[model samples]
Target: SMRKKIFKPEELRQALMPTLEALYRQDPESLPFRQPVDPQLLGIPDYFDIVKNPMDLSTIKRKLDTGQYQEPWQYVDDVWLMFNNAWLYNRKTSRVYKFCSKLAEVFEQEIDPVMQSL
Candidate 1:
């Protein structure tokens, strides 16, 4: 044994990549969560003030590509942060809040199996 090779990030990247691609291409519902939060575009000027740690699927993909993640839970945390931030900023009855739940369902469906093995 030379050194402990960390396969966690690699496995997680592989596990998450295809589902991410499918989300971007196949699902219109995932569109909001796919990109960075642009407060100017969304008319939520205080978004950054409220959401201190903003996250999105594209940033997560980049982190995966660059090997920035060291643990599986880091990935999970980012995904959850994305949703939780939305829930904090938007009303429960709002479209974005509903999208968060919809995306959460898809995320759990895809990630739960991988998480069980890890």
Candidate 2:
């Protein structure tokens, strides 16, 4: 038997939008993390080899559209993993790495309380 979900798909989907929008606001017209990384453009041919579980805001949104999340934590994990992957793949001084640090704070501030409420 399938387990009953605590938050419905619609509810979880709506909860995710604000955080995603806020992150988009971080980078205007050219939102780096808005989509998956292009290894060729960045000249990092081994991105996939290093980042085993690649993630981005668009990917998360697509998953939400398909109602693939089964739990609130799964959503949280993906967001964290997205940033973690950046932290892992980019050097400490790299712009992508630093932006992810800021994004992490935003995610925690915006998402922590909401997840606690659930």
Candidate 3:
């Protein structure tokens, strides 16, 4: 039997937007090519305990389709998305943040070099 409806697009977008925006603002050059990444994989058994069973497609789809209760539910959704992406790229947030910081430093370094060279 189905439990909750799937997430709607707006809901999914709303849940994912902030994280995506953060990723976008990151320096592309900071991405670490050789480092392995891992997901934070928050083991919130309590959250699972609250759910009667694993999420069904309908529930996921509903969440993805309608922005229902998005504000309150965003925490889980964002973590899930981040973990999935991290797994896909075989990288974790630490690596991503490090790489982005490096890229920012590289850009900063260039500012002085370019100015000095001109």
Candidate 4:
């Protein structure tokens, strides 16, 4: 199975410093949640349910604003789904189009072209 190194809190903070700094400058009060705990132990299933339903965008956004989506994997999955839906439904929008293009770029970069060619 494929594996990757898991970064520590400080390492992650350093890696994302540029983006975090930009966000901090843009809206300090709006900084995203920072969770130092485990999700399964934190009753994050309810949150995942909200993410699975796009119609609950308002509720999801509220939770995000309150830092409920802080779990590393959950946050990544939620953002992926949100942007993926936007890309699927509103490809004409610049942001949506960009996200779609970015997804393709990642696929091309990470996937085995030879396997796909076969």
Candidate 5:
């Protein structure tokens, strides 16, 4: 940690400006890992799509393992691990990106109601 630097918000932003711009400038196809947060969730059909039912997912059990994938936050790696893993896994639909928003919306509406009832 930089104990030397005080809280300088503008300085931080200015410092991060180049990398921040570069982040959004990334071409989607060039960033393959950006998609498929979970199996079938991104609506990207696997090679066996036609062989299997569209609603059926074999990889559901593989969700939330937390052992795989890149964990960006070492200080909070376990926290982010479970968060990212479970968030994607639970929200994953047989449909991909388009339906994910719908699922997220439905989740936002239902999750609070479901929890309050419990």
Candidate 6:
């Protein structure tokens, strides 16, 4: 069994090795160790009231007699939420690709044949 240490401030990259390794072991196939979160889960059109929000298409259309609102892009902005989430998703993905490359460094370095015995 492995005991964990409180992460020390100095030399932070070494501290990440175990955390990253453990996460990689848990979900080798899942991106970001948690996968790209669903835009629905990101919570727009708002669930809890998943069924209740005014911005929901059903709510927006049926709530008003005219069944219409502002400009199409305004509707697009409020309706989908995916577009809103894209920036966050990209930020997370960019970090993952960067971390993957960091881990790749462990494989990329020259093998020390003399150290293989350890």
TM-score of each: 0.84, 0.88, 0.26, 0.32, 0.26, 0.22
Per-residue lDDT tens digits of candidate 1, residues 13-99? 886676566555636677788889899998889999999999988998899888788887788888888889989988999888888
RMSD of 4: 12.2
**For model 6, what is the alpha-carbon lDDT of residue 117?**
19
Candidate number that wins on lDDT, 1 or 5: 1
Global CA lDDT computed for model 1? 0.81
lDDT of 3 by residue, 7-117 (tens): 555644554444333433454532332222312344444434333333222344344456544443553453344334433433346664455455435434433443233
Winner by lDDT? 2
Off by over 4 Å in 2: 1-5, 28-30
Candidate 2: C-alpha lDDT: 0.84
Of candidates 3 and 1, the better by lDDT: 1
Residue range 30-90, candidate 6, lDDT tens digits: 2433343344765543323432222322332332224343223333343234222332334
Give me the overall lDDT of model 4.
0.40
Q: With candidate 6 superimposed using the best TM-score fit, by how many Å does residue 73's alpha carbon deviate from the native?
A: 41
Which ten-residue region of model 2 has the weakest summed lDDT?
A: 23-32
| lDDT at position 14, candidate 4 | 37
Per-residue lDDT of model 2, residues 1-118, tens digit only: 8765487877888887677777778864227688899899889999999999999999988888788887888888999999999999989998888889998888889997777666
Total clashing pairs in model 5? 2
Clashes of 2: 0
Q: lDDT for model 6, please.
A: 0.34
Off by over 4 Å in 6: 1-10, 28-32, 40-118
Highest-TM-score candidate:
2
TM-score of 2: 0.88
Q: RMSD to the native, candidate 3?
A: 15.4
